[PDB]
């Protein structure tokens, strides 16, 4: 689901919609949420809700609009999971970072904006959160269980604003040698923070996931809110 009428233009001209939640009280910092592989669906609506209840405005852009605008898939349906994997396999990561840059720029200047912008992403969006932190586009970035971060470690020195990553110790997208690489590489830059949740696997913060772990989702989420709070000005 997206908010009717909202349109954001990316550097190359492509336009895309977004699900927007204005804030209870304005002006407020705005958090751009980078979707998982299921598009802007029920979990994104819930994330927008969560952030608005904590005092932020939130913008979740339709990153699949270059392939299939308005895609919103149910992760409980087998056929739509297969569709999510097919879209993820074809996803242009650099164009997604470009679309997030445009959504971040939009987030800076809405009527309810206080000018500060954060980004929170999950899975596919957690890997995009790291690439966005390397570009420097946001004030703070947060990535939950981004996939393939051990292949992007040469960008660690480019991160110049804070970025927080929550990783599951039982997420098999990140086996032990990958964990160690990430832990050692991120460890060289104090602007990066990574926490490992030993009893949790991938998607552990989505309440509707079979891999949901309440204690870890809760510890992660509070660390995310404490990390984003300085943007409240």
From Swiss-Prot:
Gene3D superfamilies reported for this sequence: alpha/beta hydrolase
Q: Which Pfam families match?
A: DLH
InterPro entries hit by this protein: AB_hydrolase_fold, Dienelactn_hydro, Dienelactone_hydrolase-like
Keywords on record: Aromatic hydrocarbons catabolism, Hydrolase, Plasmid, Serine esterase
Which EC class is the enzyme in?
Answer: hydrolase
Record GO terms (molecular function): carboxymethylenebutenolidase activity
Specify the pathway.
Aromatic compound metabolism; 3-chlorocatechol degradation
Active-site positions on this chain: 123, 171, 202
Which reactions are catalysed by this chain?
2-(5-oxo-2,5-dihydrofuran-2-ylidene)acetate + H2O = 4-oxohex-2-enedioate + H(+)
Instruction: Give its E.C. classification number.
Output: 3.1.1.45
Q: Where are the transmembrane segments?
A: none
| Subunit (UniProt) | Monomer.
Q: Which PANTHER family match?
A: ALPHA_BETA-HYDROLASES SUPERFAMILY PROTEIN, CARBOXYMETHYLENEBUTENOLIDASE-RELATED
Other notes on this protein? Carboxymethylenebutenolidase is specific for dienelactone and has no activity toward enol-lactones.
**Recorded family membership:** Belongs to the dienelactone hydrolase family.
Q: What does the function comment of this entry state? A: Ring cleavage of cyclic ester dienelactone to produce maleylacetate.
**Protein name in UniProt:** Carboxymethylenebutenolidase
What organism is recorded for this protein?
Answer: Pseudomonas putida
């Amino acid at each position: 689901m997206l908010t009717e009428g909202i349109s954001i233009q990316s550097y190359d001209g492509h336009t895309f919609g977004a699900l927007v939640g204005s804030p209870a009280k304005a002006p407020a910092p705005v958090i751009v949420i980078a979707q998982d592989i299921f598009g802007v669906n029920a979990f994104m609506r819930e994330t927008v809700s969560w952030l608005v209840d904590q005092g932020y405005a939130a913008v979740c852009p339709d990153l699949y609009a270059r392939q299939a605008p308005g895609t919103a898939l149910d992760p409980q349906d087998e056929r739509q999971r297969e569709q999510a994997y097919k879209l993820w396999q074809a996803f242009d990561m650099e164009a997604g970072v470009g679309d997030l840059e445009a959504a971040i720029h939009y987030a800076r200047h809405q009527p309810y904006s206080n000018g500060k912008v954060g980004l929170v992403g999950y899975s596919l969006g957690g890997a995009l959160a790291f690439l966005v932190a390397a570009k420097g586009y946001v004030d703070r970035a947060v990535g939950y269980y981004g996939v393939g971060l051990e292949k992007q470690l040469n960008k660690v020195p480019e991160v110049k604003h804070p970025a927080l990553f929550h990783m599951g110790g039982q997420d098999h997208f990140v086996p032990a040698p990958s964990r160690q690489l990430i832990t050692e590489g991120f460890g060289a830059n104090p602007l990066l923070q990574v926490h490992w949740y030993e009893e949790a696997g991938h998607s552990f913060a989505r309440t509707s996931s079979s891999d949901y772990v309440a204690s870890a989702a809760a510890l992660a989420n509070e660390r995310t809110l404490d990390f984003l709070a300085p943007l409240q000005s």
